[PDB]
Ligand binder design. Structure first.
Ligand SMILES: [Zn+2]
Ligand SMILES: [Zn+2]
Length: 59
């Protein structure tokens, strides 16, 4: 709901020598997740806008 400090770029413990250069960031949530970090039907880096699990449920 607020990010006075930069935390909006986090995700699961994933990331060690991982694909994070493709890590997806939602509109303005602290819900950034890798394609494969969700149940993924999605891996193709979206050029447009992608929604976090929360957002897709209620939007
Ligand atoms: Zn991840
Ligand atoms: Zn979101």
């Amino acid at each position: 709901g607020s990010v006075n400090f930069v935390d909006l770029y986090v995700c699961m413990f994933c990331g060690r020598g991982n694909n994070e250069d493709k890590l997806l960031l939602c509109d303005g949530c602290d819900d950034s997740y890798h394609t494969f970090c969700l149940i993924p039907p999605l891996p193709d880096v979206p050029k447009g806008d992608w929604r976090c699990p929360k957002c897709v449920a209620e939007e």
